[PDB]
Each structure stands twice: as structure tokens, then as C-alpha cells.
Design a protein around this ligand. Sequence first.
Ligand SMILES: Cc1cn([C@H]2C[C@H](O)[C@@H](COP(=O)(O)OP(=O)(O)O)O2)c(=O)[nH]c1=O
Ligand SMILES: Cc1cn([C@H]2C[C@H](O)[C@@H](COP(=O)(O)OP(=O)(O)O)O2)c(=O)[nH]c1=O
Lengths: 134, 135
Amino acid sequence: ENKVINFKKIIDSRGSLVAIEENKNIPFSIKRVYYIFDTKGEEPRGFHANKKLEQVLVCLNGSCRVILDDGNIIQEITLDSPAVGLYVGPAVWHEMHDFSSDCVMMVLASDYYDETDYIRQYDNFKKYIAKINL
Amino acid sequence: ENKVINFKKIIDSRGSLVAIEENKNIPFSIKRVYYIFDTKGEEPRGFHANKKLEQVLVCLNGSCRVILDDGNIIQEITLDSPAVGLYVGPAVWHEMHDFSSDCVMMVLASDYYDETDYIRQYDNFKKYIAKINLE
Ligand SMILES: Cc1cn([C@H]2C[C@H](O)[C@@H](COP(=O)(O)OP(=O)(O)O)O2)c(=O)[nH]c1=O
Ligand SMILES: Cc1cn([C@H]2C[C@H](O)[C@@H](COP(=O)(O)OP(=O)(O)O)O2)c(=O)[nH]c1=O
């Protein structure tokens, strides 16, 4: 199961543009937009999962390597094009690594920041899935 | 003052984080998120106004020099910080200039793209506004 989303990209003498509409070219309604920039150090991030939240992750500059695990398959994806979106469904584990220095990462979430929706134990994630599986 | 937006930025060992939340640190509901990149050239962008659309421009990388006009007064602000947003309301003429080479410009909008919400002629815009004032 592929999670990548290629967005229609407009081009011209001016540059590029990519438009992202809730419930249109994305499975959900947008309620939060966030982004990580001016990164340093060599520690990855993420390593969590969400029970309700739905997201789409995009690398708008530079690139970063993403690992997705839906409890079925672990997928690794290097993002380095603002035209490629990565769908991170509920009950899916994710991690960011290899954040280039000029990297800008953006995330579109379907819901406000909720610390309580966050699974922080890979192992617990793995379990939560099982149950889900029955 | 009512146009410029200061987003709470989070800085740590790892980097910086900024989260925008519909109707939280922005006056409207996000229906679409668009962005410009891989720019090049010396021909600007924008030069129109929208009738109902509410927007917010954010320079995620490099810089951009923007112009605003609500018919009334003219304003200019150079967006170069991911933490700064710029509110662009209905009936506001606008222009984007000087995109740095490494510029990423993002825009959060109230609704989906709609070719018909635009005013691509300044005079009509001016008119548009006049017509409004009377009201
Ligand atoms: C993603 C996100 C983060 N934040 C805050 C949460 C933290 O205080 C900070 C970064 O945390 P985050 O990278 O999500 O997790 P961690 O605890 O491992 O650092 O940014 C928000 O306030 N809202 C959001 O939507
Ligand atoms: C902003 C935006 C533009 N577009 C497309 C429509 C146009 O063919 C193209 C150009 O955007 P625009 O700058 O608005 O106009 P113009 O090309 O006349 O200067 O972008 C979308 O499809 N969706 C969007 O959300």
C-alpha cells in the first residue's frame, strides 16, 4: 500500500505552484498546519503514531527521509520534492531523518495538536494495531 | 498591526517549529494550502484582489517582497521569516516581488481555488472599492 501523493504542479516562467485542498486532493479536512525549519543536529524525529489524527507530510525544501509503518509494512521514502505528499493515516508510525540543512518540512493535519493522541512506544503501537486487528 | 502575524515559534536542539491552527492563530478556516517554489525570473506575481477570499502569506524559505493595498493605503512588507504571516483580506490588492532564488512561499486560504473571485484590473478594483464605500 502506497502512501505517496503526487500533486498537480503548475509551471511557468515564474516558477512552480502546488495547490492542496482539504477533502479534495486530500482525504481530510484541514485544521492545522505546521512546519519544521532551521534544523540542526543529527537526531531524527517523529517516532509516534496517532489514533485519530490524519496527516500529509511535505518537504518544501531540501529533503528528508521518511519511514512509515502502518503495522503491515514499513515504508521508507525520501522526500525532496514539494510536489510529493506523504499520507500518514491514523494508526501509522512515522519517522523523519536525514533532514537536509536547508530542509523545510511541512505538515497538514486534520486536527488540532493533541498530545493525548500520540503513541510514543513503537511496541505499544505494534500492540494497538493488533487489537485493531480484531 | 492587524495585517502582520506573529506566530509562536518553538526552538530546540533539533530546530524550529511553527504551528498554525485554523481559527486559532488565523482568523479563518483553512480550506486550501498552496505554495510557490523553484522560482526564477524578474516578473512579479500577484496583482489582483479577491472579493471573498481570506489569505495568509508565509515565506517558509528565503524572501519575498509583498505589496498591499486596500484601495485606501498602501503597505509593503518583506516576508523572510517562517514565523511571520501576513493577513490578506477580501478586497485587498496584492503583489509579490523579489522572490529569492530559494524562496518558498506558502499561502493558507479560506476556500478553494476559484478563478471568479479575482479582480485582475486595478481600476475596477479601485472602482470595486468605491462602489463599496458608498455602501
Ligand atoms: C506538531 C506540533 C508541535 N507543537 C509543539 C509540541 C512541542 O512543544 C514541540 C515539538 O514537539 P514534537 O516534535 O511534536 O515532539 P517532541 O516532544 O518529541 O519534541 O512543538 C505544537 O504545539 N503543536 C503542533 O501541532
Ligand atoms: C493559487 C492557485 C492557482 N492555480 C492555477 C490557476 C492558473 O492557471 C495558475 C496561475 O495562478 P495565478 O497566479 O493566480 O494567475 P496567473 O497565471 O494568471 O498569473 O495557477 C490553481 O489551480 N489553484 C490555486 O490554488
